[PDB]
Amino acid sequence: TLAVDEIIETISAITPMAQKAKKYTPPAASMQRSSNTIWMPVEQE
Amino acid sequence: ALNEGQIVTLAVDEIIETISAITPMAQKAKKYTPPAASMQRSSNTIWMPVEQE
Numbered sequence: 001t002l003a004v005d006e007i008i009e010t011i012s013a014i015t016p017m018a019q020k021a022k023k024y025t026p027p028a029a030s031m032q033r034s035s036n037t038i039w040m041p042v043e044q045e
Numbered sequence: 046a047l048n049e050g051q052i053v054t055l056a057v058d059e060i061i062e063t064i065s066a067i068t069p070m071a072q073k074a075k076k077y078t079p080p081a082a083s084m085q086r087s088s089n090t091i092w093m094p095v096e097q098e
Contacts, residue, residue, distance in 0.1 A: 004080050006093040 026038050079091040 001090060001092055002080060002082070003092045003094065006077075008093055008095045010096045011098070 031038065079089060081089065081091065
């Protein structure tokens with residue numbers, strides 16, 4: 001028997017929503033102490 | 046007339062093409078050459094890996 005390192009490629013996916021969503025990286029030193037949660041204000045009315 | 050000469054037969058050597066077929070599927074099916082050590086008509090099973098998950 002001869003295995004032949006000729007990869008039979010089988011799957012191919014895509015991640016549109018995840019590549020489209022915005023990404024945020026808050027400061028790690030403060031987020032360690034703030035219990036991994038931060039607060040953001042909302043537009044005033 | 047009654048020109049009773051000597052008769053011949055003539056077969057010309059231009060051909061009348063009749064068959065013209067196309068092979069679309071075999072021109073799209075990709076070709077492989079198996080990496081086998083010895084040339085044996087025995088079971089030619091070549092094993093190839095599948096993409097990992």
